[PDB]
Amino acid sequence: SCRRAFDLYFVLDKSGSVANNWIEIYNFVQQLAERFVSPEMRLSFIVFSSQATIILPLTGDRGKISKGLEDLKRVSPVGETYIHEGLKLANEQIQKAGGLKTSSIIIALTDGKLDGLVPSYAEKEAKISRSLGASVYCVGVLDFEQAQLERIADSKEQVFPVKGGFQALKGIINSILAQSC
């Protein structure tokens, strides 16, 4: 059935590889927040590099969202790319909000450039997200790793470039509206 309540978890790469494009990431997040202002649309901001942190715990309070955006605007990307840790912080909040009883969307902003065993960890954690009933989208930055993002997202139709033709914003907004009453 159609839904009105969505919880949107932004899982944002602040590793060194994306440092020169942090503005694109921030702008995407600000634009999607701007689009969805209802209190039944709750947002959470998570950042990750060599460790992950919840910048904005899940909330519909727009004052807190404004401050969360101020905090994201000052981020200084550096270090390694442990995307699995960012996904796990989204999963922990989803589990605490109700698990399969929730209406949960994860949007990962990343170049998908993963090292060593991180692909293994990331794919396992995204499979956990889906087991909790969440849907995973990936928005690719720079010369992003398309296949890696397709594996993390629910499918290739939930992967978009952050650059060009308003593809990512339109595609994700229209995907959410399709699920909406």
Stretch of 3-11, 33-41, 80-88, 92-100 contacting Mg ion, by CB under 5 A: 80-88
Q: How far apart are the first and last CA of the chain?
A: 8
**135 vs 148, which CB is nearer to Mg ion?**
148
Q: List residues bridging with 106 in a β-sheet.
A: 9, 136
C-alpha distances in Å from residue 25, one per residue of 41, 44, 87, 95, 169: 20, 15, 17, 26, 12
Choice from 14, 28, 81, 102 touching Mg ion (CB under 5 A): 81
Measured CA distances, 164 to 105, 140, 145 (Å): 23, 11, 17
- Tell me if 15 is assigned to a ligand binding site: yes
Contacting Mg ion within 109-148 (CB under 5 A): none
State the nearest-atom distance from the C-beta of 59 to Mg ion, in Å: 28
Residues making up the annotated binding site for a divalent metal cation are: 15, 17, 81
Q: Which residues bind Mg ion (CB under 5 A)?
A: 15, 17, 81
